[PDB]
Design a protein around this ligand. Structure first.
Ligand SMILES: CCC1=C(C)/C(=C/C2=NC(=C\c3[nH]c(/C=C4\NC(=O)[C@H](C)[C@H]4CC)c(C)c3CCC(=O)O)/C(CCC(=O)O)=C2C)NC1=O
Ligand SMILES: CCC1=C(C)/C(=C/C2=NC(=C\c3[nH]c(/C=C4\NC(=O)[C@H](C)[C@H]4CC)c(C)c3CCC(=O)O)/C(CCC(=O)O)=C2C)NC1=O
Ligand SMILES: CCC1=C(C)/C(=C/C2=NC(=C\c3[nH]c(/C=C4\NC(=O)[C@H](C)[C@H]4CC)c(C)c3CCC(=O)O)/C(CCC(=O)O)=C2C)NC1=O
Ligand SMILES: CCC1=C(C)/C(=C/C2=NC(=C\c3[nH]c(/C=C4\NC(=O)[C@H](C)[C@H]4CC)c(C)c3CCC(=O)O)/C(CCC(=O)O)=C2C)NC1=O
Ligand SMILES: CCC1=C(C)/C(=C/C2=NC(=C\c3[nH]c(/C=C4\NC(=O)[C@H](C)[C@H]4CC)c(C)c3CCC(=O)O)/C(CCC(=O)O)=C2C)NC1=O
Ligand SMILES: CCC1=C(C)/C(=C/C2=NC(=C\c3[nH]c(/C=C4\NC(=O)[C@H](C)[C@H]4CC)c(C)c3CCC(=O)O)/C(CCC(=O)O)=C2C)NC1=O
Ligand SMILES: CCC1=C(C)/C(=C/C2=NC(=C\c3[nH]c(/C=C4\NC(=O)[C@H](C)[C@H]4CC)c(C)c3CCC(=O)O)/C(CCC(=O)O)=C2C)NC1=O
Lengths: 49, 162, 160, 66, 162, 162, 160, 160, 162
């Protein structure tokens, strides 16, 4: 009976932060560079005309 | 917890939207990085003991008072708990890198760690120094791009502790 | 997600991911492109899938739109189709995720209580998701239709 | 019904303990009826072999008084 | 917890006095309202699931954003948690009405609700509006005499939340 | 429990022999049939409620006295326990089918079920009839090969109860 | 194995296996053929692996075979090689199983107590296991070496 | 298009459309579905039309793809076939428009100066468009073939 | 000017694309309304003088000062110019309704018309009122289906002038 307060009311959700999208992440940047190469290869797979 | 896929799913679920071209591009980018992530995770898993040994060696070389009598890492219990915390940080950094998302770092590492350490008298700056030494050791083992990626999660831990 | 389940399973045992789980993640990452193509195929046709599943549902269960039925009325029928569209969106989510985790977290946990508070019959939900399964697997090739039918079957089992 | 008398052996597979464990492996206990499903499931999940279960308190087949 | 009779008893026990005429008047008032309280509690017990249905329907009609994507009550899990919270509020209000005392709303309900809801991001204003919605539905159900009595406890819950 | 692979591992371990040609033949036989098992298990998972409902309808139609007053399955409680038992039987038979071994039925189904039913007064023959009903209903769903495979474990359950 | 872990994880939640777990089992049975090929290769090279592993251990640690060493004598050296053969068999079992669970159940639980009672030096175990790993990986190709060396690494960590 | 032409003619004379112009528009919109199916058919077989028309042209005019010809080489042959693709797309536009207004606005006005600046022979263009006429009208039914042939005649006459 | 068909053709021409299923859908949509547009255009042409009579009478009844000494419609010449302008607007709205597009309203009518009226002294609010009167008069003659279509072009003229 020292305290009637709730020590753990709930846990704050961590589902979404504010900012830091991690799309500027350098290896994400490298992947976005590589998908461009893949799209270009698919484009050159089409007939030349 | 969240990974990159789940993060895109959640941002398109809050809006009640089906996936657009932008979401498919984000999913493609993650699927492209997946091979590098798995390679780095396997390398770190094979070398965890080496990383902990080297990082704790630098930490205790720079902060010898931590292992001199009376220091926070002075007893076999407290030394073992120190290297166990370093192993925890390495494991959860590897999880986070494999997920591509730092939510696990907040949920399963940073939550209450600061006042855990403050209630135990664990020095937080020396823990951050240990994390930086761990980052330096890991970068040499996983290669340049994986080193840059792994530094993000190590720096997330360091900033959350600081 | 596949990576999320692997990480959580490893965490529960306080260990690094084993080469088996890393190989599982490697295969999932490899099949990500096929998964995205299937998800786009189901997304581009969502209006048709919803319309045809609603039709098939209301021929196979006329009581739902019959008087005394939960879907009686144009407004309640629109809510019915809106729920079908929710679940089709969750199915595409689970396709790209590689598991039913988004489906379970968004549309399966507490769904019995929600539909009971809504007075919605669960056999009706099961018949509706079976209708969606038929329509959506009709749009896909055999290999992709099987893997989409797996998510639809999980949804039907979770509603039943 | 209200009471099962259960004699069970629970061996050890995960580890060899410093403790004696003669207490916990071979035992007989009284588990009340609506605990028995969970208790039996837990005993089976630990790897034990349920040697016997008996009725002691109630009468099988009773409708009321359960 | 504490009811009207126990409240009178404790008030006189702290003073160490036998019951005076005022205490017997208070006990008479509670005994007189007892039949009304029992009838109201029986009606609410008979129609609780109904009450929750119309109250939730009214609240989500007045604020459709709560159950549409992006709203706090948007998912099956969060919709079910919303309904469960409303079931708490209705049942504990009925307990407090039958007791004639708001103490049980203090121990079992209002202690720490603000902290839980602000930790979860549950909108307290919308929860108060749902409590009001239950108040209209329950008051219309119980009748003229009991509606005023049950309003006391519903507004006590609302004021504790807000 | 042990699956087929762990079964052959244990059998070759008990003599302390390395895997012969026959052991690898057994393992190839299991891995060849694994994909059929995965379709069978997914199909059964999709239709567990349907299978249990059809099997219970068949059992209580062939034995109407079980659910009429005086029968072992006469109450909501005892009927619900009966259909819970059939649900567990079906799911564990699916497990044993995926594993390719009847061991899990020994460790987690038959481990004290016999004398539990005996002390309860549950009729064995009726439970066998229910297991056979699940067998026919499940085979008609999973096709010829998966039907034979599932039936093997169903008769294991029946003979364990018999 | 992987199937048993999936089953026990599903039974812990009292559910059927999810489409993700079924897909994991599908990948496992797909990898089964390569796993048996690797285990067959190590099973064929029994005596070679044992012979070079023992020779490297005895040259690297002469004290074990020297007077006062734990393996001094023909019968004690034979018991040493017999333990090596046990552990190589366990590693083959682990290769077929897809995980270190058989190694864990037969030769890792209570190994330190056993070797304490036998007065067997644990570092000698670690070095013998490392020598076995080197020989086994050498006799293999580039691909098989990784997955085989993972099990030897686990075993050495268990001894260390 | 037909409607644009009628409206522009009425606007020049600052009047409303006559019964004749309205009747022309009514007969135009009455025949929209069949000309629209014709455009569908030509769009479906675009790659086959370009392939066969280019083959026919280069068999009839080998000097174009021989050294010194304008279309010699893979790149210049591809530019030739791409011009054919341009003109086929214009023909589909003209079919749905009901007149050759898209064809004239995009591919006729100024074509002489353009192809003179490109050293492209005009008899080569007329041979190419007649090849495409033959190939495309081969696919369609007689009345639709005649309709499409009228547009290809307009184009050949514009180039010649 | 461009009609609806050439609007689609231009959309696909700038992209270098053959007609999609959506392009064919838009073309079918324009072809379906063609008989309706032709009927409405014929009705409007047959009743242009009547429409102008009604709309101008309404405008001069609602704004009498326009036709009083000193007003912009005060003379025979300026009144005739007013009704001439109304005939302009009706005829060009009919052109736009046949075309299924408002491009001709932009190029032929609304271009520089605001500055022209400002320089002339023509009240532009009164002209928008006259156009609204014309819309109302035309909608009754052409019928609800055609009225909804003609209202779009009358509104385009009014918004461009406003
Ligand atoms: C009060 C309880 C306690 C103990 C016992 C303890 C031991 C301890 N020994 C250490 C280093 C060391 N310890 C040893 C001792 C080994 N060298 C030989 O192999 C021998 C087998 C063995 C000693 C008989 C050595 C050589 C080092 C130096 C490690 C290095 O320089 O890399 C360190 C690292 C930090 C430092 O050197 O200041 C600790 C913490 N710490 C404690 O808080
Ligand atoms: C302090 C009083 C006390 C004792 C002594 C005791 C003994 C005991 N021995 C056990 C198992 C065992 N006991 C043995 C020993 C036997 N195997 C060989 O044949 C030998 C001839 C022989 C020993 C000399 C073995 C091998 C097991 C493991 C059996 C199994 O696999 O389950 C177990 C089961 C749980 C466990 O493995 O820890 C107990 C409880 N229990 C007690 O409460
Ligand atoms: C993403 C997870 C999620 C789901 C699925 C969801 C469904 C959902 N459906 C609702 C209404 C409804 N839902 C249905 C659909 C049912 N009627 C027929 O019987 C069918 C069997 C069945 C559909 C196949 C109907 C008829 C209503 C209207 C009920 C009413 O107004 O009383 C409501 C009440 C509020 C609203 O209408 O927006 C919710 C929250 N909400 C969620 O957050
Ligand atoms: C004393 C406790 C007890 C109860 C209550 C009980 C009811 C009960 N009703 C049954 C069938 C049934 N019960 C109903 C009644 C439903 N039809 C409509 O939907 C209504 C909503 C509702 C009636 C108001 C129907 C239609 C069946 C046949 C279902 C079938 O054959 O599939 C059955 C299955 C076997 C049988 O045919 O008797 C039971 C066990 N059994 C018990 O031991
Ligand atoms: C995981 C494996 C497993 C099983 C299957 C299992 C069965 C089981 N069934 C029970 C009761 C029961 N079981 C039944 C089922 C029977 N009645 C009908 O006639 C049928 C012929 C037949 C089923 C097909 C009934 C009616 C009861 C209630 C008995 C009573 O309360 O008198 C109980 C008593 C405890 C409780 O219900 O909470 C158990 C433990 N336990 C286990 O650990
Ligand atoms: C299948 C799992 C399993 C293992 C691993 C196992 C180990 C084991 N090794 C033993 C003896 C032994 N083992 C060794 C081996 C050591 N000598 C050197 O120190 C080396 C570092 C090292 C070998 C690499 C020796 C020397 C003995 C003889 C012990 C003695 O006679 O004192 C014994 C005593 C029984 C016997 O000799 O047959 C066991 C039980 N038993 C098992 O059931
Ligand atoms: C300064 C140049 C000028 C002129 C001449 C002029 C005439 C004129 N007469 C009008 C109405 C009218 N004008 C007449 C006059 C006709 N009724 C009989 O048939 C007679 C033959 C004839 C007159 C001799 C009538 C009866 C109306 C009322 C029409 C109505 O309200 O329906 C109106 C419409 C607004 C109004 O009611 O005042 C104008 C603008 N406006 C001008 O700015």
């Amino acid at each position: 009976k020292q305290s009637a307060e709730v020590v753990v009311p709930s846990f704050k959700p961590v589902t979404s932060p504010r900012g830091m999208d991690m799309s500027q992440t350098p290896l994400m940047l490298q992947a976005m560079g590589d998908i461009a190469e893949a799209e270009q290869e698919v484009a050159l797979q089409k007939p030349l005309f | 917890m969240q990974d990159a896929i789940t993060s895109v799913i959640n941002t398109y679920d809050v809006q009640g939207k089906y996936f657009d071209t932008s979401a498919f591009d984000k999913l493609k980018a993650y699927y492209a990085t997946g091979e590098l992530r798995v390679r780095a995770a396997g390398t770190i898993s094979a070398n965890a003991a080496t990383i902990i040994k080297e990082a704790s060696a630098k930490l205790f070389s720079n902060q010898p008072d931590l292992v001199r009598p009376g220091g926070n890492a002075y007893t076999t219990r407290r030394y073992a708990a120190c290297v166990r915390d370093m192993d925890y940080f390495l494991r959860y950094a590897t999880y986070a890198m494999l997920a591509g998302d730092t939510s696990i770092l907040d949920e399963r590492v940073l939550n209450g760690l600061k006042e855990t350490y403050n209630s135990l008298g664990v020095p937080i700056s020396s823990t951050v120094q240990g994390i930086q030494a761990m980052k330096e050791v890991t970068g040499s083992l996983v290669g340049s791009g994986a080193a840059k990626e792994m530094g993000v999660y190590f720096d997330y831990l360091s900033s959350g502790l600081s | 997600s596949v990576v999320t389940k692997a990480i959580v399973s490893a965490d529960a045992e306080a260990r690094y991911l084993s080469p088996g789980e890393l190989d599982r993640i490697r295969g999932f990452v490899s099949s990500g492109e096929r998964r995205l193509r299937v998800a786009q195929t189901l997304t581009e046709s969502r209006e048709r899938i919803i319309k045809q599943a609603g039709d098939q549902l209301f021929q196979k269960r006329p009581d739902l739109v019959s008087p005394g039925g939960n879907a009686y009325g144009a407004e309640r029928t629109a809510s019915c189709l809106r729920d079908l569209d929710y679940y089709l969106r969750l199915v595409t989510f689970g396709i790209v995720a590689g598991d039913v985790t988004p489906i379970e977290e968004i549309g399966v946990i507490g769904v019995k209580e929600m539909y009971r508070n809504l007075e919605v019959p669960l056999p009706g939900m099961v018949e509706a998701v079976k209708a969606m399964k038929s329509v959506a697997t009709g749009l896909l090739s055999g290999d992709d239709s099987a893997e989409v039918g797996y998510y639809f079957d999980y949804l039907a089992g979770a509603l039943a | 019904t209200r009471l099962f008398k259960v004699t069970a052996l629970i061996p050890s597979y995960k580890k060899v303990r410093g403790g004696r464990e003669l207490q916990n492996t071979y035992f007989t206990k009284l588990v009340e009826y609506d605990r028995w499903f969970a208790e039996q499931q837990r005993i089976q999940k630990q790897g034990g072999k349920i040697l016997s279960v008996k009725m002691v308190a109630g009468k099988p087949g009773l409708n009321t008084g359960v």
